[PDB]
Ligand binder design. Sequence first.
Ligand SMILES: C=Cc1cccc(CC(=O)N2CCC[C@H](C(N)=O)C2)n1
Ligand SMILES: [Zn+2]
Length: 138
Amino acid sequence: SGAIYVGNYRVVNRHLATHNDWANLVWEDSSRDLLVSSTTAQGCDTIARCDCQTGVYYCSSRRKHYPVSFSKPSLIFVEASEYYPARYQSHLMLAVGHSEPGDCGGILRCQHGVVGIVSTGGNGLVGFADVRDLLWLD
Ligand SMILES: C=Cc1cccc(CC(=O)N2CCC[C@H](C(N)=O)C2)n1
Ligand SMILES: [Zn+2]
């Protein structure tokens, strides 16, 4: 679990969005596993606007942060799950690192700000949904 709080927006994994996120829907994209909802309170976070390929992510299944080298956002095949059919997820970045299903929502940050959130993983890999291209969040 986890979310990004920027301005009057809350960014979460689309597959983990609550009834309240859907009732205050701003934008969603199944192909990116992202959903953005509106908030009444002003958020705590700032978004990176950069091309960093190194950063640090929070891994809830280890209660720890780990440094990572990650690939550029791209279209990656993701096997079927209880949440989505087998499909290509876009704007996804992969890295070598530990992750388990409940780790989705953990923030990936570089020196410039928030880069994205954990969205996929398995077998020593961790995948992050990029948010740096969503300029309207600012
Ligand atoms: C087994 C490790 C692991 C680590 C991290 C996450 C997962 C689960 C996973 O990747 N899913 C299920 C939820 C929706 C995801 C998607 N973006 O399509 C795909 N599994
Ligand atoms: Zn950066």
